[PDB]
Amino acid sequence: MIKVPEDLERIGRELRARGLDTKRLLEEGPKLYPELSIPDLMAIALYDHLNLDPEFLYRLLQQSR
Amino acid sequence: MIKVPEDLERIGRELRARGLDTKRLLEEGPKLYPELSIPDLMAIALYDHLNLDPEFLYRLLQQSR
């Protein structure tokens, strides 16, 4: 589902808009987005609280794969 | 290298003590700890800035594996 950095940002914005802080995002994120990997959701959590460049997080995710 | 939650906390404390913020931790962490996976380092980054329970992050890492 994360084919480009834009997808990381889109899903991240969506989950945070629900009111999910980082812990709740890591608990609810996987239920709402079962197609994402745990590393995907950790990267989204980092984007959502620290506003790290989605390009950087995307590149890190590519390495892990 | 992360066989228990204690290892996540130990390495996290070590990297943050060097002055590494989250972005620099994700850039320098892999160089300093080449034995860790990218998901390992993302979990350590989450612990170091948000103080999420290392037990929770450890359990998430087990799932990914």
Numbering used by the authors:
A (entry chain A), B (entry chain A): 1 to 65
The publication says:
Here we use deep network hallucination to generate a wide range of symmetric protein homo-oligomers given only a specification of the number of protomers and the protomer length. Starting from only a choice of chain length L and oligomer valency N (2 for a dimer, 3 for a trimer, etc.), the method carries out a Monte Carlo search in sequence space starting from a random sequence. The loss function guiding the search is computed by inputting N copies of the sequence into the AlphaFold2 (AF2) network, and combining structure prediction confidence metrics (pLDDT; per-residue structural accuracy, and pTM; an estimate of the TM-score) with a measure of cyclic symmetry (the standard deviation of the distances between the center of mass of adjacent protomers within the predicted structure). To eliminate such over-fitting, we generated new sequences for the HAL backbones using the recently developed ProteinMPNN sequence design neural network (accompanying manuscript: Dauparas et al.).
